[PDB]
Curated annotation (Swiss-Prot):
The chain holds residues 432 to 726 of 726 of the full protein. It comes from Escherichia coli (strain K12). This is Catalase-peroxidase. Disruption phenotype: Cells are more sensitive to killing by nalidixic acid, the effect is mitigated by pretreatment with 2,2'-bipyridyl and thiourea, both of which inhibit hydroxyl radical accumulation. Belongs to the peroxidase family. Peroxidase/catalase subfamily. Disulfide bonds: none annotated. Bifunctional enzyme with both catalase and broad-spectrum peroxidase activity. Also displays NADH oxidase, INH lyase and isonicotinoyl-NAD synthase activities. Homotetramer. The N-terminus is blocked. Formation of the three residue Trp-Tyr-Met cross-link is important for the catalase, but not the peroxidase activity of the enzyme. Induction: By hydrogen peroxide.
């Protein structure tokens, strides 16, 4: 109430066939699944329930300061291309198109998992100007951790796994939603980083449930590499090969009572369809967190 971030009147109004031409422009753009999903996730995940600031509306991912955040350094590499596309289409905002990109990325992911879901998209976002994006006040929002992206700074404040809860609650996520969300993001190759931490799959960019299966496989022994236990390795008990690395955000999903009961739904033989759905559902939740006009 006391601080609101201004947004401009929409200068665009895409029809359902604009959108579809846009999805096909993004699809033919050269951006990988992981680049698509990263740029969208990085737009949307600034949301803070209650305060209601941040979110994907306004494309402030493209503005200062978010554009310089360490968390975003890889996500932001996608913007030149998406910008070029928004400008040549002229049917929709950078904001709407950063999100649509995530949408193309998830569906493309899911159709490699030999799935075929449609990711609900909601048009209408506008682009904020730098002048409606107060630097000092979005500075407060730079995240200390985003376990959805396996990002973690300032190792002396609180803990990696507690910051995961905090983050998820900020986005108003339920436990299954965080869960679905984390396991999806891992397999789509959306760490903030190049890290392979938690990327438990041979096929990155396939929206599989590998994260959950591999997470709970007794074939794998997990051990901290050093006294901080910020980094683990999953060694294959058979071959003795180090197959996987993991952070605390990855592994808390197998240590915690509640998170674990959820990961086994999703590691279940028959669960793929259930997880993909739940991912898409939680995915669209985050994308739309700030879409007040719509509700």
């Amino acid at each position: 109430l006391i601080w609101q971030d201004p947004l401009p009147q929409p200068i665009y109004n895409p029809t359902e066939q604009d959108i579809i031409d846009l999805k096909f422009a993004i699809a033919d753009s050269g951006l990988s699944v992981s680049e698509l999903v990263s740029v969208a996730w990085a737009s949307a995940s600034t949301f803070r329930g209650g305060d209601k600031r941040g979110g994907a509306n306004g494309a402030r991912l493209a503005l200062m300061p978010q554009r310089d955040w360490d968390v975003n350094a890889a996500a932001v590499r996608a913007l030149p291309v998406l910008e070029k596309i928004q400008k040549e289409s002229g049917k929709a905002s950078l904001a709407d198109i950063i999100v649509l990109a995530g949408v193309v990325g998830v569906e493309k992911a899911a159709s490699a998992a030999g799935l075929s879901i449609h990711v609900p998209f909601a048009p209408g976002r506008v682009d904020a100007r730098q002048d409606q994006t107060d630097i000092e006040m979005f500075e407060l929002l730079e995240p200390i951790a985003d376990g959805f992206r396996n990002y973690r700074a300032r190792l002396d404040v609180s803990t990696t796994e507690s910051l995961l809860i905090d983050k998820a609650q900020q986005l108003t996520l339920t436990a299954p939603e965080m869960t679905a969300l984390v396991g999806g993001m891992r397999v789509l190759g959306a760490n903030f980083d190049g890290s392979k931490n938690g990327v438990f799959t041979d096929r990155v960019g396939v929206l599989s449930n590998d994260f959950f299966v591999n997470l709970l496989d007794m074939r794998y022994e997990w051990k901290a590499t050093d006294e901080s236990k910020e980094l683990f390795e999953g060694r294959d008990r058979e071959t003795g090969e180090v197959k996987f690395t993991a952070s605390r955000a990855d592994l808390v999903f197998g240590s915690n009572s509640v998170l674990r009961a959820v990961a086994e739904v999703y590691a279940s033989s028959d669960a793929h369809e259930k997880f993909v759905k739940d991912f898409v559902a939680a995915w669209v939740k985050v994308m739309n967190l700030d879409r007040f006009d719509l509700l």
